[model samples]
Target: CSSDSRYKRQVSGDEAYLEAAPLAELHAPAGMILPVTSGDYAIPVTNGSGAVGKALDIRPPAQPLAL
Candidate 1:
């Protein structure tokens, strides 16, 4: 599910295929960590439980003091 560039944009509501696949139902008990890279910066995201039922709500961070 990767692309040519590190910066990949995933369209929402595209989980129908993944949700219907029985083999994809496996869960990660220890949770999972996803590293997101933007340009030259990389951010680490940790999921408490490796349940695929969860959803991630992502949005831009608040503007800096200098705007």
Candidate 2:
């Protein structure tokens, strides 16, 4: 059988994401009055303690069976 690293796990490139640092918080100037916006653009956070980088599989999760 032939071989390719792209489809394999624990490869060299996989560490790229693992080595990245966390993002800094967005800041507004003290004297600047930020615009008041509606909740339509709001997005909530989820699953901060979940699997990341190599531990995270790109594959789609299995769907639940219909009743």
Candidate 3:
């Protein structure tokens, strides 16, 4: 079943991401490489300029439960 109705904010939708600031630029000390504890969890920056606010799609991802 579609999980859109399960969200508490179904009416207003999730606008938190719309107002969120872009990821900050990482800086390291001069002559020193930035030490990354792990690269597997790093989130890459993305650019977007399209539907926002109420126009954004708020449908939840379909979850497949173990049968």
TM-score, prediction 2:
0.41
Model 2 agreement with the true structure over 1-67: per-residue lDDT tens digits: 8667475545555477666665544667999867764587755686679886576776768899798
Instruction: Name the regions of candidate 3 deviating beyond 4 angstroms.
Output: 1-14, 45-53, 59-67
Best by lDDT: 2
Stretches > 4 Å off in candidate 1: 1-13, 24-54
Residue-wise C-alpha lDDT for candidate 3, range 1-67, written one tens digit per residue = 5565544534454557756786667888899998874878786555666666456456677799798
Count of backbone clashes for each model? 0, 0, 0
Residue range 1-67, candidate 1, lDDT tens digits: 8556632334435656645654323354566744433455533455746534234334357676783
Q: lDDT (CA) for every model shown?
A: 0.47, 0.67, 0.65
Which consecutive 10 residues in model 2 have the weakest lDDT in total?
5-14
Which of candidates 2 and 3 reaches a greater lDDT? Answer: 2
**Residue 55 in candidate 3 has what lDDT?**
62
Runs of candidate 2 exceeding 4 Å displacement: 1-7, 10-12, 34-43, 57-67
Candidate structures ordered by lDDT, highest first: 2, 3, 1
